[PDB]
Amino acid sequence: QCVKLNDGHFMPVLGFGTYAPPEVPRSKALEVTKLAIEAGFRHIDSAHLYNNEEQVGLAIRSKIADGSVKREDIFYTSKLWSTFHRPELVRPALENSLKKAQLDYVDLYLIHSPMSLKPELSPTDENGKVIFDIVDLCTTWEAMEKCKDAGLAKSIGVSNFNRRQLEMILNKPGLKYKPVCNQVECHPYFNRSKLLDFCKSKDIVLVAYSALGSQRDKRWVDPNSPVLLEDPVLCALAKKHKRTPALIALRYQLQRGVVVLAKSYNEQRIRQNVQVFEFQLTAEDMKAIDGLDRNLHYFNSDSFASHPNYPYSD
Ligand SMILES: NC(=O)c1ccc[n+]([C@@H]2O[C@H](COP(=O)([O-])OP(=O)(O)OC[C@H]3O[C@@H](n4cnc5c(N)ncnc54)[C@H](OP(=O)(O)O)[C@@H]3O)[C@@H](O)[C@H]2O)c1
Numbered sequence: 001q002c003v004k005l006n007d008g009h010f011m012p013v014l015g016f017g018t019y020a021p022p023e024v025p026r027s028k029a030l031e032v033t034k035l036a037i038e039a040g041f042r043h044i045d046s047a048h049l050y051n052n053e054e055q056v057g058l059a060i061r062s063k064i065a066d067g068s069v070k071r072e073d074i075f076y077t078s079k080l081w082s083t084f085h086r087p088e089l090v091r092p093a094l095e096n097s098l099k100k101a102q103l104d105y106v107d108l109y110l111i112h113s114p115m116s117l118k119p120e121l122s123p124t125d126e127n128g129k130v131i132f133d134i135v136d137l138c139t140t141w142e143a144m145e146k147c148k149d150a151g152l153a154k155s156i157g158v159s160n161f162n163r164r165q166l167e168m169i170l171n172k173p174g175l176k177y178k179p180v181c182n183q184v185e186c187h188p189y190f191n192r193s194k195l196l197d198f199c200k201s202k203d204i205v206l207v208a209y210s211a212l213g214s215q216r217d218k219r220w221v222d223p224n225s226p227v228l229l230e231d232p233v234l235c236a237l238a239k240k241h242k243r244t245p246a247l248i249a250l251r252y253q254l255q256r257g258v259v260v261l262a263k264s265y266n267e268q269r270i271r272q273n274v275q276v277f278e279f280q281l282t283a284e285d286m287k288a289i290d291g292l293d294r295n296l297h298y299f300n301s302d303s304f305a306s307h308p309n310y311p312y313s314d
């Protein structure tokens with residue numbers, strides 16, 4: 001089922017992850033998203049960065065056209081990339097994203113990250129050092145507010161913000177709309193409980209990404225770090241409930257009132273992940289998973305760690 005946003009709109013509590021790396025043909029994005037919708041998914045998460053909006057838009061419009069689903073049955077998220085943080089660029093980037101997906105509006109538009117870059121998805125100096133930018137994100141937000149006001153996005157939110165960055169938006173002068181959510185890295189090795197409480201107290205949904213340990217992408221993730229789905233507690237619980245570690249991890253998020261994203265480009269696992277609605281972890285199960293937290297984020301950059309808006313300390 002869904003959950004009510006601080007704006008009145010509803011968000012399905014399970015969402016499909018759509019990112020896949022360059023080497024996965026863009027055609028593939030259209031298939032998987034369709035299987036996702038057929039399987040039961042009603043929340044779809046894309047981004048400009050992901051470069052798959054044409055197919056994801058099509059996927060959706062394809063399932064409206066086969067009578068599977070109405071449009072308001074579907075919750076579609078896109079995201080503003082960091083080269084577009086300047087307010088005069090927010091709306092054009094949203095419009096672009098809509099035009100690509102042949103769609104009238106997105107349910108949710110996010111600030112992908114607070115790490116502003118220079119107005120190239122990854123702009124780079126003479127040496128290959130990525131070029132930072134410093135923008136007042138409150139002006140980015142006022143621009144996001146004009147997009148909601150204009151019906152182009154039903155709900156607005158942020159992604160990758162920490163507590164301090166969220167407070168910055170929440171105490172902006174003349175604030176019109178709270179962010180409805182804050183999409184963040186969240187899984188049992190990095191549960192973000194403190195930030196989860198804060199978000200809750202501000203009537204902000206925490207949406208978990210990489211809740212399955214991520215795609216372990218070579219650009220971002222240290223190959224040393226342990227594979228989430230291989231954890232013995234997550235594996236013990238899978239047997240215990242006759243399910244898979246993935247399913248344990250997803251259901252874990254639901255029972256803390258966290259909306260959870262799951263990515264798969266495999267038809268079996270796409271169908272599997274909706275079994276998350278078929279079973280319950282116990283109170284003991286939950287405290288056991290709570291114990292797994294070890295302050296480990298899969299995404300890393302020595303480059304970005306020195307960006308003035310880097311969200312994690314350390
Ligand atoms: N806001 C951001 O900055 C941000 C960052 C990262 C991600 N996201 C969102 O998060 C979404 C997903 O997160 P993620 O892409 O990092 O991946 P993820 O959800 O952690 O999943 C990672 C891997 O788990 C595997 N997997 C999925 N279901 C499984 C199952 N039932 N059993 C076993 N393995 C399974 C998948 O492989 P297969 O594909 O082989 O099934 C996938 O590669 C992304 O699509 C994106 O929408 C947002």
Ligand SMILES: O=[N+]([O-])c1ccc(O)c(CN2CCN(c3cccc(C(F)(F)F)c3)CC2)c1
Pocket residue numbers: 019047049113160215217220299300301304305311
């Ligand atoms: O699978 N994927 O490769 C993949 C899939 C979906 C995505 O939205 C992205 C893009 N990410 C890049 C990392 N980023 C981030 C956020 C915080 C810290 C750090 C730091 F620790 F690295 F600095 C990085 C969030 C946005 C990559």
